[PDB]
UniProtKB/Swiss-Prot annotation, chain A:
Pathological association: Intellectual developmental disorder with polymicrogyria and seizures: An autosomal dominant neurologic disorder characterized by a broad phenotypic spectrum. Main clinical features are developmental delay of varying severity, intellectual disability, seizures, and polymicrogyria. Additional variable features are non-specific pyramidal or cerebellar signs, and visual impairment.
Protein name: T-complex protein 1 subunit alpha
Compartment(s): Cytoplasm, Cytosol; Cytoplasm, Cytoskeleton, Microtubule organizing center, Centrosome
Similarity-based family: Belongs to the TCP-1 chaperonin family.
From Swiss-Prot, chain B:
The protein's name: T-complex protein 1 subunit alpha
Function: Component of the chaperonin-containing T-complex (TRiC), a molecular chaperone complex that assists the folding of actin, tubulin and other proteins upon ATP hydrolysis. The TRiC complex mediates the folding of WRAP53/TCAB1, thereby regulating telomere maintenance. As part of the TRiC complex may play a role in the assembly of BBSome, a complex involved in ciliogenesis regulating transports vesicles to the cilia.
Parent sequence residues shown: 16 to 80 of 556
Binding site for ATP: 22
Gene designation per UniProt: TCP1
Species per Swiss-Prot/TrEMBL record: Homo sapiens (Human)
Subunit structure: Component of the chaperonin-containing T-complex (TRiC), a hexadecamer composed of two identical back-to-back stacked rings enclosing a protein folding chamber. Each ring is made up of eight different subunits: TCP1/CCT1, CCT2, CCT3, CCT4, CCT5, CCT6A/CCT6, CCT7, CCT8. Interacts with PACRG. Interacts with GBA1. Interacts with DLEC1.
Family of this protein: Belongs to the TCP-1 chaperonin family.
Swiss-Prot record, chain C:
Reaction catalyzed: ATP + H2O = ADP + phosphate + H(+)
Record-given protein name: T-complex protein 1 subunit delta
Intracellular or extracellular location(s): Cytoplasm; Melanosome; Cytoplasm, Cytoskeleton, Microtubule organizing center, Centrosome; Cytoplasm, Cytoskeleton, Cilium basal body
Phosphoserine PTM sites in chain numbering: 9, 157, 175, 417
Annotated EC: 3.6.1.-
Length: 54, 65, 511
């Protein structure tokens, strides 16, 4: 828990190393990505509840 | 093979759009018709343009749109 | 044996339909995709819709889908349950045929098992003693919130409850038909502004006839022409005889004037005109004349709505103009135009004498999909209420009735004699599929769940099953899902009659 600043190291989009994505790096809006996760899960439910085509 | 037939189609769509996820991703040649060659590396455009042929891919792309 | 092979083919087709429907049973039932030649698919978990859209061709499959439709039209719901219960009845049937039991003995044994099941569900129920507002409202709320539909159930259901109560209050064994409580759609408005309306409300037709309001509006049905005679042409002469159409229609106008004057001496205030396509049109100038002595008209009413409103306003059918009697009309208390409830003009009529206090539900919204969700929600509410009134009960759902029946009916078959005893035991073993498949549409493994339910019902606790709020066996109280028994006993009766018919067959012959 002392390393709470470590919450947000991610890959650099334009590079291949993990970077501290607040002190530097890219940001993406929380709403768009939280909705991305939500719609991804809803898709994975709607297409997985399928059983057969008749 | 009644659910895997859907999972594999969705996985194929993911494999197609995967190589262009980030800003450094590769270019996709999408041809919905003969001669209409298009080269875009943003997966949203190809998803709007890729002519899915399987209803699972249909619904997944519909939710993406 | 050739008849045996054909009967096996029939029961196998029934198996195919039941297997197609099984996984969609219950609120947590999985989705199915329906593919047809039109070039797309649809996603749904309602087995009734699947059978409606299914390209059913086999005779036994046709009988099973007719069973689903009959269950939907007669009982409130449970088509997905009745189809699968019939399929597993056919499963026990094929097992018993392999054991060598002749189908007629199987049929009589299924009648004995069915009557025992009706008795045990009669003993399943807690007497809800519904007699007043609060009982009906509480039963409706628990039934509605026990199922999937919950977003607007507590909002729109109470008006439907009040209407279907006020039409018939007391403890009548027969309940109100949906043909007695018809619904009307307004695309405009909201959800909360929906209401129960006595009489009839319908879209605009009349203009420039004092449309503001009429007291004691005499309403007359029309199924006869009010225009010039029509043929291969609208006239019997050349359409270019410029001097002649005038000189013949100057008396044809007198003819239609005599018609509207006859309508006047009949004593009408508003008119009820039948569906148009099977009849000639109506001359708007005759409408203009009948306006000036303050008489309106309503036209293009669908036939089913015609007999609906006519039997609910004391007006008998009008096959011709000759019947001029004043009693021929209906006597509504008020006809008036409501305007501010969204775009469109609503001709609402109420207060007419009727053999029963008929009421219609004006459903409202803001989108076509909104109208559809509202309409099937109110339809489900109405059918649930009427089947509740037919037989007062709130038995537990989610696998409880058939587990407890399988236990008690297995005991009964143990006490029974003849091949009928073994067949009734097979009846119980067949019926234990639906709790098993409800578990198999929940996280729990079906076998452990069904044996746990059987043990619970064999140790008291006569109401236990699988709910919607979770997957485990928690149906002692509160979170338990409950239904009026009539849906379950109708599932049993209809499925038993269908399996009786199916095994009653040796061969399917072509005329």
């Amino acid at each position: 828990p002392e390393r709470k600043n470590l919450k947000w190291i991610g890959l650099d989009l334009s590079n291949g190393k993990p970077r501290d994505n607040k002190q530097a790096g890219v940001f993406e809006p929380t709403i768009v990505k939280v909705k991305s996760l939500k719609f991804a899960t809803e898709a994975a439910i709607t297409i997985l509840r399928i059983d057969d085509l008749i | 093979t009644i659910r895997s037939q859907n999972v594999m189609a969705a996985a194929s769509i993911a494999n197609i759009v995967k190589s262009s996820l980030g800003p450094v991703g590769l270019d996709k040649m999408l041809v919905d018709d003969i001669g209409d060659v298009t080269i875009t590396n943003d997966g949203a455009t190809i998803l709007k343009l890729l002519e899915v042929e399987h209803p699972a891919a249909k619904v997944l792309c519909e939710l993406a749109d | 044996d050739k008849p045996a092979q054909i009967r096996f083919s029939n029961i196998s087709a029934a198996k195919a339909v039941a297997d197609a429907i099984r996984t969609s049973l219950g609120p947590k039932g999985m989705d199915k995709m329906i593919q047809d030649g039109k070039g797309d698919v649809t996603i749904t978990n309602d087995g009734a819709t699947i059978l409606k859209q299914m390209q059913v061709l086999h005779p036994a499959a046709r009988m099973l889908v007719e069973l689903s439709k009959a269950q939907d039209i007669e009982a409130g719901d449970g088509t997905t349950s009745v189809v699968i219960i019939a399929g597993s009845l056919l499963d026990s049937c094929t097992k018993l045929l392999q054991k060598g039991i002749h189908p007629t003995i199987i049929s009589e044994s299924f009648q004995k098992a069915l009557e025992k099941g009706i008795e045990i569900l009669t003993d399943m129920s807690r007497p809800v003693e519904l007699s007043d507002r609060e009982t009906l409202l509480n039963s409706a709320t628990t039934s509605l919130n026990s199922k999937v539909v919950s977003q607007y159930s507590s909002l729109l259901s109470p008006m439907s409850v009040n209407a279907v109560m006020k039409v018939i209050d007391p403890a009548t064994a027969t309940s109100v038909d949906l043909r007695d409580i018809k619904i009307v759609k307004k695309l405009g408005g909201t959800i909360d502004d929906c209401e129960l309306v006595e009489g009839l409300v319908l879209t605009q037709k009349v203009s420039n006839s004092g449309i503001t309001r009429v007291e004691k509006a005499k309403i007359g049905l029309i199924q006869f022409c009010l225009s010039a005679p029509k043929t291969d042409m609208d006239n019997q002469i050349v359409v270019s005889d410029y001097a002649q159409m005038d000189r013949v229609l100057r008396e044809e106008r007198a003819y239609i004037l005599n018609l509207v004057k006859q309508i006047k001496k009949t004593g009408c205030n508003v008119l009820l005109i039948q569906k148009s396509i099977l009849r000639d049109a109506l001359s708007d100038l005759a409408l203009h004349f009948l306006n000036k002595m303050k008489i309106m008209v309503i036209k293009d009413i669908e036939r089913e709505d015609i007999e609906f409103i006519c039997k609910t306003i004391g007006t008998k059918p009008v096959a011709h103009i000759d019947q001029f009697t004043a009693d021929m009309l209906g006597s509504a208390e008020l006809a008036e135009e409501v305007n501010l409830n969204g775009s469109g003009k609503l001709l609402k009529i109420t207060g007419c004498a009727s053999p029963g206090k008929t009421v219609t539900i004006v459903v409202r919204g803001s989108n076509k999909l909104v109208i559809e969700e509202a309409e099937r929600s109110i339809h489900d509410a109405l059918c649930v209420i009427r089947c509740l009134v037919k037989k007062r009960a709130l038995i537990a759902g989610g696998g409880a009735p058939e587990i407890e029946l399988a236990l008690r009916l297995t005991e009964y078959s143990r006490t029974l004699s003849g091949m009928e005893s073994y067949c009734v035991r097979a009846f119980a073993d067949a019926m234990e599929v639906i709790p098993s498949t409800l578990a198999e549409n929940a996280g729990l493994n079906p076998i452990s769940t069904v044996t746990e339910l059987r043990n619970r019902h064999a140790q008291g606790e006569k109401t236990a099953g699988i709910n919607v709020r979770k997957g485990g066996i928690s149906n002692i109280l509160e979170e338990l899902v409950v239904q009026p028994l009539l849906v379950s006993v109708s599932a049993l009766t209809l499925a038993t009659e269908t399996v009786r018919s199916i095994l009653k067959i040796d061969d399917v012959v072509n005329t």
